[PDB]
Assembly symmetry: D2
Homo-oligomer: 326 residues x 4
């Protein structure tokens, strides 16, 4: 049986409710040892070691936990066969992409959460955890990047996103599809991400104790420039715009971000729109403004990459090249 | 033949490109008269009158144009059979909901855009415009609220949203589905929005020359409180949170918005997540904080409703009731 | 305070007797006074006209005795049964179908909560006059549009053309849609006195398709044949040939599509009026069968069957 | 500077001779040196084995003469043809299929830009070694997973299980996926010397389904029968009966599903090894037919056909 390390960070998967039918849930309550012990069936498919990293709702996920996770995986890569990270659902997709860029182990790293607490009727956590371990244990999962396993589906950490606020089936790779489906404890992989991940990225956070400051501003009708201005005022390294349509900006936001990019703030145009690329060669001449188009990376994903791009370079052409290959 | 009034506001539907294959487009270039004349086939199905309201990219849409549109439709409701509004795609879904709440005519009001300029190969604007008129002309379209007609589909202004950055098929009613499909210039309606719209809402903007100030803050891992703080500092009437998952907030954003709601700022929890309701009775006790859950309204839609709710009342219980019925 | 809900069990992975099933979900007791009757205990892959006729008559007979019905059922043909009941039930109280994608013994089994939410839906006053319903994965779906979209996913049931009626959260439903097509007491289909249904078969279309299935139905003197066509209800030539001649000896022929969403329309490439065919609109081939079988209890005239496929 | 692209025309709404078609989209001249050959001029609803065999042989014979192929085709069975070519083409240069949902004369017709993007895809060096492709609505889709999801929508073609390979914007493609299942020169299927294919028919399953289509194929001595099952490939009893006896006189039986997404799996409710059936995995019934017809040129053994349905 393979050696699988479970790194817990919290989430509803480690929470509870006051009855089997209540909809109000706690987060990060149950310790990794108890969490692992609640699914004895894991012992059929791996030798599990549990470690508590933090115990929080993933809505409070942050740079400190990200750095911690990457360093821990990178250090311990040698001495296990794969990793599962238990995490809240809310920002699962951000952490998975951050690890997909900073983990240098080629061994399977699989993220998993639950939409219902283990106390609820038909709770999804036990089987999710089982399937996540199945995936971490499978030789075929190596070299595919950081994965998220939810609803019997293996999803790449780049494209995966939370598409519905409550559905157990919420996690989908909405532009390029999943890698594999899980049936009877086995996976038929038919796809792997072509974008460079893990050991083929330049991003090395091993010696870093902070990341560049990158915030996100939303666009909509009559959008205030005040949020963009506050980020600039605070010397943020980067700003990601959640634009309208194909990465467009409301005039007053556009004006502030244009000014910030001429003084050296990195500006990435992403989109509030849930599928499809923010392209070049549409309404915004990115070269002219010193902006970067995010491609299929949604705003929170664009943030991840831009923060890491900023550990390498402050140059808009070099950042756009990063956004074309990772 | 029915009398149909076309109110133009701009968009790519009224723009162009330098060749049939270029991807870079102008917005709001073509005047309503020329725009109507480019589709002579409209004269088979209606007597069209065109009026230019503004000529802009809908990424620059704003409160002034909204007020203008509602007042114009309300004034002229008597003296036409229906309306089509040509508009950019980027914020089409915001304007359609704003009109869905403030138009008091029960006659069909139909919004339409194009994803490609009329100069491009297989441009979508001509047929979109034709189908929008078909819909405005159809007796069955009355009493269904403000509609958007794109890709042979009739969509309610509440649920409709732009789901893809470039696809002609981008507009979808992602929670409840469309009202009707268009084939051979005819519509089979099988659904109508149960939420109160048009003449069954209390919202009357006829004498207003501004709307309440409502901004949108995004949530993500390590989110700065600076945007929320700038809105509060500027005395915004309302703030909508584009939360993570089921409307959750990053701790520092939560802290700022909690404070703003205790001093009387209206705070609506919506979600960055593209489908499903922001519910009550999940992780956030809205009553305790004086917050309002947005239901299926996405952040930009929540903004529309909250601005209008703020013309009636500043009370969180009364605003939540509005968010339960409109 | 609690409504009386009748559970009518037909089998499925959700099930093993109806008593065992109810007694394994004791939380139903918080929302309803549950009464269980075993109608049959089969996999829905073996569902048939007799079970349909039985369900419809029982529901209509016992309508006065209860506040609502939940029908436990296999997933495989739940969308067929739901539509039949949608067209034949005259009781105006909720009738909700439910199944399970996972075995009751499996980790994270869906059945118990699915059942709970089905009873919630049948208990809700707001559920009445919306036709027959299917309740799966926290969603309430109308019996006409609802279909099984995936072979294994717990989220498989979707109303692929017109969307769901409502979502369930915390034992409460926010309904924002109701089906406009006529149902339940507004249809003319009355199966009270019927002990058989008309014979309607389904033939598939594909590259190089054989005419042998279609001829074998026609030789068997089938009252109706539904074509699962390609694209917008088109047919492979040797199949069009058989059905065109069969529509003319009097066999009703409905064109549907193997394509999983969208309408088989009139006025595309098949001149239906010329051949006496009927276009199925958004009804998939199995759903078209249900409606065609019922149409044929009222009329054999193609023009009148079309009107039926335009109203129901 | 421009690549030589061969357009092989088979008909469809996209078309009317191949010369007229090419000459109506003169913008193709900016991206390719286009050469047109009329192979056939039919609606794809009447597509067949002979056209398939013809396309495969022409592509393989003329591989050296051109840099890539675009096949203009009806939409109705484009996903069948694409998969056949996916399994039989040995040329490693791009082969891209394309159609149109709207008439060429209609407002906002899709054909011209669809054709342009198909030629862009066949011209792109990055398109090579990805198998046979379908290019529709600004998207590049692999021939195995791609299917027609809607009867009328211009956005109908989707890879419903594994997603698209790449999106087209401004005449350029960002490929992020390639099919892992073996294709093109990595399959053993060689149709160079073949002038017929094995006979494989499709039967539909539904409530109360007739065994008559299945018996009529078996009586006709069909080499294979694909079942479009319910749910996870299940069969109505009287249909399971016929196929179980037929698999035992030697007819190959593949279980697929009418359910539009997801795998017909092994190890669910049908003990395939016991009955000598083969599970289709994610291949829908029409796609399973393609693979079963080709399997049967190499072997009649059910265990070996299964291995084929596990690798291709
Ligand atoms: N279901 C969940 O895990 C949601 C929770 N707020 C979290 O992300 O930690
Ligand atoms: N296609 C379009 O209309 C997009 C444009 N930026 C607009 O919204 O005005
Ligand atoms: N999950 C299930 O219910 C499938 C089963 N074959 C049925 O329809 O009964
Ligand atoms: N739009 C089309 O191509 C449909 C036509 N029946 C075909 O497949 O040829």
């Amino acid at each position: 049986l393979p050696n699988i390390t479970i790194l817990a960070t919290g989430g509803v998967i480690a929470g509870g409710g006051d009855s089997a039918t209540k909809s109000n849930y706690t987060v990060g309550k149950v310790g990794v040892e108890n969490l692992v012990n609640a699914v004895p069936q894991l012992k059929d498919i791996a030798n599990v070691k549990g470690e508590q990293v933090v115990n929080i709702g993933s809505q409070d996920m942050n740079d400190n936990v990200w750095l911690t996770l990457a360093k821990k995986i990178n250090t311990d890569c040698d001495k296990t066969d794969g990793f599962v990270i238990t995490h809240g659902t809310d920002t699962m997709e951000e952490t998975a992409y951050f690890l997909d860029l900073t983990v240098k182990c080629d061994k399977p790293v699989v993220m998993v959460g639950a939409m219902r607490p283990s106390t609820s009727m038909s709770a999804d956590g036990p089987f999710n955890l089982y399937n996540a371990v199945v995936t971490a244990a499978d030789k075929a999962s190596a070299n595919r990047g950081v994965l998220v396993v939810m609803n019997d589906t293996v999803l790449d950490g780049r494209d995966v996103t939370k598409t519905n606020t409550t559905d157990v089936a919420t996690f989908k790779s909405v532009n390029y599809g999943p890698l594999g489906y899980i049936h009877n404890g086995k996976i038929d992989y038919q796809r792997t991400p072509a974008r460079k991940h893990t050991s083929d990225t330049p991003f090395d956070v091993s010696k870093l104790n902070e990341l560049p400051k990158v915030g996100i501003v939303y666009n909509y009708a009559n959008a205030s420039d005040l949020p963009a201005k506050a980020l600039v005022d605070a010397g943020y390294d980067g700003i990601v715009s959640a634009g309208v349509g194909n990465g467009n900006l409301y005039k007053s936001v556009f004006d502030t971000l244009a000014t910030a990019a001429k003084t050296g703030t990195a500006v990435v145009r992403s989109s509030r729109v849930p599928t499809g690329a923010t392209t070049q060669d549409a309404e915004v001449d990115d070269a002219k403004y010193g902006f970067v188009a995010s491609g299929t990376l949604n705003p929170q994903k664009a943030r991840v990459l831009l923060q890491l791009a900023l550990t390498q370079t402050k140059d808009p052409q070099q950042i756009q090249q990063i956004f074309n290959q990772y």
